Design a binder for this molecule. Structure first.
Ligand SMILES: CCCCCCCCCCCC[C@@H](C)C(=O)SCCNC(=O)CCNC(=O)[C@H](O)C(C)(C)COP(=O)(O)OP(=O)(O)OC[C@H]1O[C@@H](n2cnc3c(N)ncnc32)[C@H](O)[C@@H]1OP(=O)(O)O
Ligand SMILES: CCCCCCCCCCCC[C@@H](C)C(=O)SCCNC(=O)CCNC(=O)[C@H](O)C(C)(C)COP(=O)(O)OP(=O)(O)OC[C@H]1O[C@@H](n2cnc3c(N)ncnc32)[C@H](O)[C@@H]1OP(=O)(O)O
Lengths: 354, 354
């Protein structure tokens, strides 16, 4: 259905960014075959075919190399050296398929003093300034779940890597190795802060910048029911619209960008938002340019009309899953196929004519 | 010198995800031409040629269509309808270039009850459950900068769309429109949590899950010097290594996953970490699998040897900026070319033959 219809992807079963990257390829129509160790309830494994092989046996390695020989992309998220030892390194795969985009998904990268060291998202964004920038200033840093290292600065960059190399392959006729490190990707994800730091527009003080919570017009507020709204009214005209819905006289308030009076401004805004329930503000702004929105819990998302009308989610059995993003006007993506039964690796090899 | 060498991109000057998406294309070797209104210190504007046009004028519109006519990709991030009213909408562009990938970068999407409504990253993640999940449980949610909406679920999905549509064009010989809504992209970015919620592995309770700060083995700790380490020792063997390095006896501790005793477990780890300075812990956990890393501020990143050795950053006039990601073994990217003076739109047309 989607734009990636026809792309053949071999995924070497891992955790975090690799399976997320392979999911998105599958979402957009790619033919994704996942090799695991010898039906899943993990919705992330939608849009797959699962085969199983012992990659350490002679037989297991033979079939995998036959399946790789007929594929465009290979995704692996093991420590550097692992596929090399298995006999599935890029130098080995090239001998059977020099068009393969060999996509290596790691946190620390392929080389360097930390390249062989265990880690998780929180570690990768700890070394590059990111984690230090997240949270309130009166407290130790909070992890932004694993959104920044694993996915935003991880699978997403593997994805751009894969498709960019597929583009390069059109003219070269050949593939290459993509080295996607969470530490690199997340750095480029946050290039805006690096840019701002050079010009005095961002500081290393946590919780005291325009976009981290420090600004009263870009932060959440608790309402009378103990739920929250999000205020994002950066531009003066949107800020104006926000004060107008709150019924605050701007002449009575400190200026929007007088940072010396920010705690005063926040105390006034906090008093206003505390005077009514979330769904009141919910309704007072619902339609304006005030950049004020309800802070919905996951369990409330499916009831939001904008979410509903655009089909951002679909029901799997037992809960909502996000539909494929982004959206394409001519070759639209299908509703994802749920995880299905592990199939015979020989069936795939015949299908792919390997 | 990257993989996207040869790719022609027109960027309509904007803010946030569009410009970040444009930068990454230029990073990977694309020929990006940014049309602005009638020399920048914004590092995000690297790898561009900048031209000027009044798109409200007859001459300016005409010039843009000549430029778009010779491009592969067009990036625009205005409210839906804005390009249509300028005479640069998808249907207008189709008439001069039906190979064009028309990439539309919004928060709320091209259609829907909120599609005409102003907003910013914090709004888009407020409506889909993401923001509610970020922060400590005792206090209101904290924005994870604009990493999640603008970039990870914003420009990154625009990029995936652009590149996937280009693969698609290989067989169809045609472009199409890419509708990248931040509200969609970020939901796919947090799909692991939608997976986990369905299987009893994630709760809507802020700050009480595996990866949100709720686990003592996945969080930051404050050290003797008032600086922090990140701990991410999820796996038992990594956890065991962590305890060893702290000098703690596992038989004297609650089990790693006895959530009932998590506050007990956290208190003991807190005491341990606070007994030495942050850099003591890096020394202690230098090469180990304890998943313990120093929480560095942006200003300190350039001193970290793993950062240094892998050339994750380059020095640009001003300060450090992230080098391109991900990395490619055969067609590697160049160090980004700095922002330069605005050039004559007509010289670009001569170059591109438009
Ligand atoms: C919940 C998600 C957690 C979230 C917060 C995250 O951040 S997840 C991201 C974690 N980090 C990464 O993915 C970075 C790159 N990966 C790594 O550093 C490591 O793979 C991990 C994740 C630290 C795990 O380390 P580990 O458990 O020692 O495993 P590795 O060192 O990768 O080696 C894997 C061993 O398994 C074997 N293997 C794999 N597939 C097969 C197969 N089909 N048949 C037979 N054997 C297989 C490999 O041979 C390898 O063994 P060996 O070569 O080490 O002896
Ligand atoms: C320092 C802070 C102050 C700077 C501004 C704030 C941004 C800085 C903060 C950092 C990033 C912010 C972060 C949190 C974000 O979320 S960024 C993403 C924000 N959202 C989006 O981009 C979603 C799609 N965009 C939009 O909804 C809206 O463009 C915005 C962003 C809400 C802004 O609203 P707006 O200013 O009314 O813009 P639009 O409604 O698109 O109207 C644009 C008008 O300008 C005109 N225009 C543009 N270029 C030209 C040109 N070269 N020549 C002649 N005219 C030009 C267009 O024709 C259009 O006019 P019209 O259609 O109104 O008649």
């Amino acid at each position: 259905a989607g734009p990636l219809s026809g792309l053949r992807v071999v995924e070497l079963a891992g955790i975090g960014p690799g399976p997320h990257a392979a999911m998105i390829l599958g979402d957009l129509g790619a033919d994704v075959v996942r090799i695991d160790r010898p039906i899943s309830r993990d919705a992330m494994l939608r849009n797959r075919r699962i085969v199983t092989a012992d990659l350490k046996s002679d037989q297991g390695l033979e079939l995998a190399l036959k399946l790789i020989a007929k594929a465009d992309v290979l995704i692996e998220g093991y420590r550097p050296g692992v596929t090399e030892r298995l006999g599935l390194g890029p130098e080995e795969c090239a001998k059977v398929n020099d068009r393969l985009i060999y996509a290596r998904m790691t946190g620390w990268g392929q080389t360097g003093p930390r390249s062989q060291q265990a880690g998780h998202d929180i570690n990768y964004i700890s070394l590059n300034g990111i984690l230090h920038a997240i949270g309130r200033g009166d407290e130790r840093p909070v992890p932004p779940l694993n959104l920044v290292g694993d996915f935003g600065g991880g699978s997403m960059f593997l994805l751009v890597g894969i498709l960019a190399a597929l583009w390069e392959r059109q003219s070269s006729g050949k593939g290459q190795v993509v080295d996607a490190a969470m530490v690199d990707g997340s750095s480029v994800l946050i290039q805006m802060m690096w840019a701002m730091r050079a010009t005095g527009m961002w500081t290393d003080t946590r919780g005291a910048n325009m976009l981290d919570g420090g600004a009263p017009y870009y932060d959440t507020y608790e309402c009378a029911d103990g739920r929250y709204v999000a205020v994002g009214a950066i531009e003066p005209q949107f800020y104006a619209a926000m004060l107008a819905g709150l019924g605050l006289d701007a002449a009575e308030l400190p200026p929007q960008n007088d940072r010396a009076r920010w705690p005063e401004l926040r105390a006034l805004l906090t008093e206003a938002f505390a005077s009514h329930d979330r769904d009141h503000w919910g309704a007072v702004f619902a339609n304006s340019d005030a950049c004020v929105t309800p802070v919905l819990a996951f369990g409330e998302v499916h009831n939001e009309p904008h979410i509903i009308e655009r089909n951002t989610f679909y029901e799997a059995n037992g809960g909502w899953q996000p539909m494929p993003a982004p959206r394409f006007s001519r070759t639209a993506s299908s509703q994802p196929r749920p995880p299905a039964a592990t199939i015979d690796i020989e069936a795939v090899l015949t299908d792919w004519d390997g």
